[PDB]
Symmetry: C4
Subunit: 510 residues, 4 copies
Amino acid sequence: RKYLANYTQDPSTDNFYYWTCVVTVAYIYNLLFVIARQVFNDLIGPSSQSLCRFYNTTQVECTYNMLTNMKEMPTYSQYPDLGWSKYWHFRMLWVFFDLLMDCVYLIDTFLNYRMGYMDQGLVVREAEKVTKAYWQSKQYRIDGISLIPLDYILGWPIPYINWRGLPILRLNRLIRYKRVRNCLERTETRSSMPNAFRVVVVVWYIVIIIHWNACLYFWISEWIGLGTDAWVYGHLNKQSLPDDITDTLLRRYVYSFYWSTLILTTIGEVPSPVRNIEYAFVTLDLMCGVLIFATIVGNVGSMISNMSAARTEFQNKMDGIKQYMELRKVSKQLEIRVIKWFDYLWTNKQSLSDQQVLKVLPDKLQAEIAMQVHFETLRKVRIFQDCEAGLLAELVLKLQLQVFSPGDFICKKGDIGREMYIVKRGRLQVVDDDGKKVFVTLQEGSVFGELSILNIAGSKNGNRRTANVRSVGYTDLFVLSKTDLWNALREYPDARKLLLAKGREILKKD
Amino acid sequence: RKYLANYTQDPSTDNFYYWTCVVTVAYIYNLLFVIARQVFNDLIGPSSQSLCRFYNTTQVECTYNMLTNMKEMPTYSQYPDLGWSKYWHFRMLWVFFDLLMDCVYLIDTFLNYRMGYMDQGLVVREAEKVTKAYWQSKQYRIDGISLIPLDYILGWPIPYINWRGLPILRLNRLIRYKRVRNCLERTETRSSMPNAFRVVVVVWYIVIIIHWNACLYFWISEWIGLGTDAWVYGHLNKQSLPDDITDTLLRRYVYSFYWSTLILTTIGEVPSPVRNIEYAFVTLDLMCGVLIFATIVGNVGSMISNMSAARTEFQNKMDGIKQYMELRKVSKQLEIRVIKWFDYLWTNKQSLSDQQVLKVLPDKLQAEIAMQVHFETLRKVRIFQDCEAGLLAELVLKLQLQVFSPGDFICKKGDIGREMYIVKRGRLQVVDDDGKKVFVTLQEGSVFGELSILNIAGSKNGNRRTANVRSVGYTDLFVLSKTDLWNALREYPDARKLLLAKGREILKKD
Amino acid sequence: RKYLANYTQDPSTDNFYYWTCVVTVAYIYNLLFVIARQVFNDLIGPSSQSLCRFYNTTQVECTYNMLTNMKEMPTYSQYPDLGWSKYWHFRMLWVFFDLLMDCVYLIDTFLNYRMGYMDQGLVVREAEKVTKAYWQSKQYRIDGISLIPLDYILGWPIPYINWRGLPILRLNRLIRYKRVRNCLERTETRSSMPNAFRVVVVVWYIVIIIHWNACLYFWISEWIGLGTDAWVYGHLNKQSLPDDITDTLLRRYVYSFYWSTLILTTIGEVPSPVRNIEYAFVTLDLMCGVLIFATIVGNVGSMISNMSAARTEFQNKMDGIKQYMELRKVSKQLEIRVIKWFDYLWTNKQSLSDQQVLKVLPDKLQAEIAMQVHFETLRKVRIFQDCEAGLLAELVLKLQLQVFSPGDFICKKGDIGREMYIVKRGRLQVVDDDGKKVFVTLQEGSVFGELSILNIAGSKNGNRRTANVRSVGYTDLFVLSKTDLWNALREYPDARKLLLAKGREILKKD
Amino acid sequence: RKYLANYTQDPSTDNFYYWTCVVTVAYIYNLLFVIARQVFNDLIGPSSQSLCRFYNTTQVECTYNMLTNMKEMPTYSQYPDLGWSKYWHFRMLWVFFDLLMDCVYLIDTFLNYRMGYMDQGLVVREAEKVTKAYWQSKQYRIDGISLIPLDYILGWPIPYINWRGLPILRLNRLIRYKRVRNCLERTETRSSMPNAFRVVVVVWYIVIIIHWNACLYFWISEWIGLGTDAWVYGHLNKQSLPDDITDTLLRRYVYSFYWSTLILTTIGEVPSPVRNIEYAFVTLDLMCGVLIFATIVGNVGSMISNMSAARTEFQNKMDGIKQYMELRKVSKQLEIRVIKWFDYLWTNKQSLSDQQVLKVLPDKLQAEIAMQVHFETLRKVRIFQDCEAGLLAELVLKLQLQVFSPGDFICKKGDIGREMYIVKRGRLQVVDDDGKKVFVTLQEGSVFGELSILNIAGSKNGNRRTANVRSVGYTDLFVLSKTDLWNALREYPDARKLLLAKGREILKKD
Ligand code: NA
Ligand code: NA
Ligand code: NA
């Protein structure tokens, strides 16, 4: 057991993220149930009995039929010992759970004690060094000590004598929120489908908000006499107690939740304020809503917005194009051909310009990603395989995928060669004179367009396309600009030797 | 008929898009009418009779005057055989239509069997290969089999004995939605006016949404006793049955549709909830609305937004300009002149920078588009026509249209020549000394500004404008930077020969 | 008068814009008053008398006290001749005005006949050519003929016998809207304060929209029996006729306008629908509103948004900066100094990067604008004034204004000279050794930093700052990069001669 | 005291900003309390007594129990001398405060007299020059004189005879608003947390707006007979005076504030208009709200939006990345590694590209900022410390921080050297053959990658990495591209001498 005294925690383990998730469950526990325990003291308990009165006029106890359709509100008369004698299982449950959550807080604090802080990229896991880092950071001990007084035990509804119980004291536990943030932040970055999680979270915000606010309605409604006017919960406003509904805990939470729902989303179909104090409230609360919920739902909207912003960008680009063609009265054949290009461009979803990977990432990560992705396709290329050098490691960074429509000339005889293409998919044939030539077909992995780039003129043609290469269907090519090939080629003269060695043999035929 | 056994379907035909459109009509059929058939069982049928009671106190049948202004809700008493004996035409109709839709589903599945998948840009239309692709893709047979059990026939209101009918089983047909998406996606990209279609679609979403939700109101309202409180449809809430209105199917759908309209757009002018279960509902539904419709209508807004975003961008640029001139106290003549420039720039709508075509498209498509568009205008140019080479094919990519105000010097004597202009429209005159010179007028298609770019100095003037060219009205010029002309000119020395051959003859006069 | 037969109109005159503005007033006339004349036939007229009945039970005429607090709606009993005998001034007014508006339409059509269309930048003002252009464009005669049948005269409430009058026929005049657009488009581009006008316009849209819709409420309310239920205007719904209010035209338009206001902005505090037909309406209308007004007010918001987007961009940039400095724990002195830089940068509003003028405008317009603006400041510069060449015309395009904080070294001894500064405002002193040197002060218009750029080394110092120049307050400098000065300097060797001629004389001292 | 006659004020002192803040408090004073004093004349006073009547039917005075549950509104009967005899403390208070605020206005005007205007970057503090600048600017004396007539004293409720008092005259003070703007503008630019202040301000706007509007409701409600219908405040609409609430000033302001809250945020749960005039009002006011508040709350939303737009941008970039990796089916190991890179990138918040500082700021400020920040880190570098020249001053502008994942090769043997790295944090070891070499570890401040950049080949290796450098954890490097190092190195040949002097000694080992 002595090993668990000098034990140090690494912040960067998956297990720890599981733990932070646990702290999170404890947190939500408190901020959901504590306040509600404070307001609806009917919950743990009750700590008193109903004393409803029926003529035929003695005060009686509570009968589930006499808590319906009441003339006046039921007087709350307190027990001799309020509590545990009548209700035992319940209170014991709540103590087990609170005790549990608090255990989570404690264990979390022990881990905070041994948190392997990070000195220059490495995790420092040490005996006295870590604890040193703890107490040198005064904030750790300050907030950390603040939420574990366990003052709630003394504020709980126990004792039986002279104390109602202030469960609201548990609110001090709410100051550990930083841990919870560090959880959610790290959960988005894990989730396969982020915007899913990211929307679920926000729905929870709304529900807790609405919750607390409901509790506020009910508390304020307790503070003012409950059943003394048409705005405070109770028989006086017929909205909450229609005649045939029976009074309960469930009802109160239900109606209060409904009330808060409306006021916070400004439908406002709620019985109107009757005391200056209430106007104070309802206005505060209505304004609070027109700002709070404005922003909130203007974020849910933005979230479901940026979700499929790819598609939005796309339809933008395209509509631009089509507009341009309608106004300038281009042919029908050409316009059709274009829109077919876009269609196939988007039904393959290879349309991703990858400028994401380019810009945001470190250069090295671009190399390994593109490596894996195009790995098999390049694996069947003469040029990259032949050179011992990982020159490929250079060129991968700068290859751009271009899609060509079917039956269309990639190349024409007697044209300037600037690019050199490597086929990712589709098959294309070398032809001259609109057929009857040697239809030579290159499949994926093949290399062409290289004769012009390499400045060799055995037949004296020059930077001219020797043949004209045609596509048979929708073909995707890697495009490597002359400048890049050459700027990279000085570094590896062997590749020069091999590529030129092939080039002499291709120009030999001519 | 054996030819229709080995028949294979091409995904890329116009006819197929017509077909997918048909599948679409079947889909909408189901998701509109199925659920409603489930809820309003009054529709197919009814399967029972009304049994309203009037004193003077025997239970009677239904009279269209006694279904108005009722004291209590009508008891539904079931037929001996519920159904087809009394109503025949109707049920037969619904069976013909369901059977029809199902035929569409079946034919669609046979086409799915023979779907010519695309291997490397070409469509593979083959006997066993295609079917191989079907069953290798386990998802095809999984979802495809799932929606055609035809289980509805066994769940339909038939039999007469012991079965009410669960039309809701037909819901399994809803899982073919992917086909419908592939339709809409392909319809936007076809439509001449996209944003039209794109708005119509969204209006349909809203209506189906509102629809289902209405059905939900009515179902939930059936499940709770119908006419037992002030929130469930029926005589109890005077909103739906005002005294003089008669009860009907039409009414129910109408009121329920209205109700859903309000709750989903949070006007919420609707009789308030009376049972805890209903609060549960209405809150669920209100929140559901404040998110669902928030986003939806925040998209209709965005759609009508980006529609004419051209114009918005424009007014932005301009307001910037005008602001700049007011603050810096520029003259009145100059400011007027500018705003006239913008006016004519926007009344011709040739203001499109075409950077759409530039950026989004493949380079080759830019060439053919601009080819067709400027085709006639360039068709009357000496330089492009004279050279046998399709050098034009190079330059078309890099020509920028510049608009010049009337009476203003394009060129002045003794200035650096950097550009070379080709006139798209307007006419402009060569003049020296503010008139009395040889007013030489070039119309569209003409070429000038070329003497300075070509580094020839027979009179030793240099990269200097020989004359000063003036515009007579609003003239549009093609602008070709020196660097481009030259970088392109090395490739075709013949064009050099001809252009210089003209240049010597123009400088000969001087 | 024969001169007014062959008279041709120029589209590009200020007078014409005044005219289009007039056509606009006629347009608004029609789309505001026509529909209302159609609905509230009380307006022109009435064409009948009230026939209210009071017991003590004969039908009587209308008394302004008996049209209040009514038991039942007043029966409309028609005149023997309905109209002009009782009311004369009014109807004559409406005919004078309609006739007037129609005159505007006619004159507009004669101008359309003679509209000088624009052939290649110049306005073609000709006898038969213009008319040729009219009838060759079939649309001109089609829409143009369509709105002037004058069919209204035959549909007016006259005749006395057998005709009620269909003023709604005048709706055909609404098809000239294109002219009105061409007005507003041209008014924004004129207005000194655009966003003012641009907001006023939109407020008019809202009001006309709300208007028509009100008329719709009232029409539909006429079509259904007026005063037969709690949703149609009239004594039945106590919202419109509270007991003490008297019935009038004014009331109807007022209440209907209010009603439409609510339904179109979904407050919806309006008596609820009572007939299936009405639900049809109100839903149609509510949805119509949640889309129409969503967009509309989401545009008013966007308008008041982009208005002062300068300021928004600014606060963005700055908050970024301050954030950066807080996190990285920079000093206090430095941070203060920065924020003072921004303050003075924004209190002078010379902060405009002018990239508006740069990007959007033609290159020539940038030259003349900047010419005028900096005209006086440059007018007092040795270098620009001395050279006969308008070389300035080159450099003006590429000068960037840089603001420097007070007391801070623009230059330090022994540093690389890359830029050359010209002072726009402030005064700065040449000093060495933190004072006690020759404090030489350059005011605006002065030129310095030029010794290093010009590659002259008589003392062999090189591209080194000879002295160190210090600012006394907030000084604004023109900045001209070495590359620009030089690239421009090859073109004018005289400027070289003069600048170097000064340079030898400044380096002479050393 | 004569020194305070020729005393001139500097606009650019902290004290002055304190003063403007004071003027601000006076301003808010007026625009909050003046209008309310005008409307609720109950406030200062009252100037009359209540005269409520109770049968058992003589008119009596006011009793706080008889101002509850009234049958009819209380008649206001005026005093013989209305005012100061009965209420003294109050009125004296208001006069002291108004007089105070006015003193602020006066002192502000004296400061305006002596405002040191800024001529060419320097503050001109002079005797007659400043006053000259005052009166030459006619606007100063125009608006400045306009708000200090002190006309309020003559409009105050005094005199006792024949005057009710028009406090509203004080409105003329509202025209000094420019000063207040110049305060707020300068407060944002000071505040550490801007968006805090920026939101608080907007909440004040809303409250003042709502305020005035409330006053408007109440004024209009006074103008119409108060307690004559169900829309004007008073016993007639049971919303404001429910039976048990007593009538007061407090109530009026409360209810009116509530009313305005609803109408301006279109909840609109308010008793409906009863006179044509009121419809006029409420519609005006409702429309006014649907525009005013639309924009306002669409700004609070935008404010809380751009607040943490860093984080939004980040999640955008990342989600892009993860999407890309899911679709293209990259490995699990690589994907994990990436997301860990992002995690550590964002948990250090050193992720700021600093392009803010780059773009927005002057070049010199970038130098000093980065100087301070990286000061200690660079303070321990051989290269920068050794060279006497402040060459560092050059390179600081162009160093980019790159983060590398742990255990990953920064360098590999036999690769092109393009960059040269300086370690900001982390430690990394030089190793060959996957261990067993000389593990040489560089800590922060160290310099490497320099051998390849400097074109020296004593062993003939060339621009090749001699060793392969590996990281042990998450290491941050300064990256200096070859082009930059060299372009900067020509300027200081000494640095060349030293760096090469080290290079020979490192290549000596090999
Ligand atoms: Na509402
Ligand atoms: Na409402
Ligand atoms: Na609302």
